[PDB]
Amino acid sequence: EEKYELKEGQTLDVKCDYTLEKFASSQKAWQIIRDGEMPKTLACTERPSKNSHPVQVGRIILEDYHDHGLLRVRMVNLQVEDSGLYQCVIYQPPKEPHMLFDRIRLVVTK
Amino acid sequence: ATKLTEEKYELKEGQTLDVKCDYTLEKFASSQKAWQIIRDGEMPKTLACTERPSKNSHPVQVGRIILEDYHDHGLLRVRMVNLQVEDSGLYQCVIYQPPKEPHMLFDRIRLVV
């Protein structure tokens, strides 16, 4: 329930920590939580996740810092319609993803 | 947990910003490293960098910026001395690794003077 208020054109830059010894090479994803608590994946790493390589999907950039146990997420050139609830997960189909810890709320205004 | 990449430093004119940027020693000890400012609509801009290769401990001084690369544990120390209001901004430590994009070390620094 951390909430970040940003303006159009700005960048959200966050770090999601995970247990290095368990999840460093696990595939990971950034999701928006839509109506009815229904997650939608907007960007994911490769399987296995590559250390450091920036993965850019649309305006989202993922960078997995294997040596520090965190996934960095950037949402660049923000738009009002990016506003919502987001989370990092460990992406492991065909099982349901493992939520890493928490969700955040992003609010983008003009 | 999920947190902002930046860490906020609120300081007064005349004081010194003194931060550490940890890195993986066995990968990056000799790599050239830099302190950059992140301005809106521009590429990150290096204000000071180590030599290539980076020397153990010897300070590099550019204006009021002091860089020190400690090879005992793999840590880049950055100071900005005699701080001015105009120093306020968003900064990062990076490791150069051409032809890849520079690799950012955590945490970014949100400086408010």
Side-chain angles (χ1 to χ4, degrees):
Chain A
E1 64 183 344
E2 293 253 296
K3 175 177 73 67
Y4 311 120
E5 296 266 353
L6 293 167
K7 291 290 182 193
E8 281 212 324
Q10 298 196 292
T11 289
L12 177 66
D13 190 350
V14 299
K15 46 175 185 270
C16 294
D17 57 271
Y18 62 79
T19 302
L20 180 159
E21 297 85 356
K22 183 72 211 72
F23 297 125
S25 74
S26 297
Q27 182 166 41
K28 307 184 188 66
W30 182 240
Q31 311 191 302
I32 186 169
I33 307 304
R34 302 213 291 203
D35 279 354
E37 286 292 319
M38 298 173 64
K40 178 172 172 53
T41 296
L42 301 179
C44 65
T45 68
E46 298 297 336
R47 173 200 66 205
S49 177
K50 294 286 269 295
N51 173 61
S52 302
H53 173 248
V55 181
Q56 184 165 2
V57 187
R59 289 177 294 109
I60 301 164
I61 309 170
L62 307 182
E63 279 137 14
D64 199 349
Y65 281 60
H66 288 198
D67 297 338
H68 296 270
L70 65 91
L71 183 68
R72 181 189 182 192
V73 185
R74 278 183 288 165
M75 297 182 63
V76 305
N77 190 26
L78 286 167
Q79 298 174 16
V80 297
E81 290 170 282
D82 295 332
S83 305
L85 278 180
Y86 291 85
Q87 60 182 20
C88 289
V89 303
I90 305 300
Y91 191 90
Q92 47 178 14
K95 307 166 225 195
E96 182 172 52
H98 173 73
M99 242 186 102
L100 273 177
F101 189 70
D102 55 6
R103 301 116 68 95
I104 63 87
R105 179 169 292 284
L106 170 63
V107 184
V108 182
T109 51
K110 283 180 174 194
Chain B
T2 305
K3 295 291 198 199
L4 295 176
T5 293
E6 71 185 52
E7 184 80 346
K8 194 181 184 219
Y9 285 76
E10 308 180 14
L11 296 162
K12 281 105 174 286
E13 279 175 71
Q15 300 192 331
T16 288
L17 173 68
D18 191 349
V19 300
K20 295 177 166 358
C21 288
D22 177 76
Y23 68 84
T24 300
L25 185 68
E26 300 80 4
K27 287 171 180 176
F28 300 124
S30 70
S31 298
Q32 186 165 41
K33 314 183 179 71
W35 179 240
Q36 313 195 299
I37 188 163
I38 298 153
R39 289 193 178 106
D40 304 55
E42 302 188 16
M43 283 182 73
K45 179 186 173 39
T46 288
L47 302 179
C49 60
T50 71
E51 295 170 17
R52 181 161 89 246
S54 181
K55 297 244 190 89
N56 195 172
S57 304
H58 297 347
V60 177
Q61 296 184 66
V62 181
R64 295 179 288 109
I65 302 167
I66 310 173
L67 266 33
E68 297 162 68
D69 190 4
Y70 301 151
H71 292 171
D72 55 352
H73 291 303
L75 110 58
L76 182 68
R77 178 188 187 195
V78 181
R79 280 180 285 178
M80 296 184 66
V81 307
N82 199 9
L83 285 165
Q84 291 158 19
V85 164
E86 299 160 320
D87 293 330
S88 304
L90 183 62
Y91 296 83
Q92 67 180 9
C93 295
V94 302
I95 299 190
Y96 295 166
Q97 44 171 19
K100 296 166 178 193
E101 292 300 301
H103 178 65
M104 188 197 69
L105 308 174
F106 277 88
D107 297 306
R108 279 192 167 181
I109 306 296
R110 168 62 64 188
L111 178 61
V112 177
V113 181

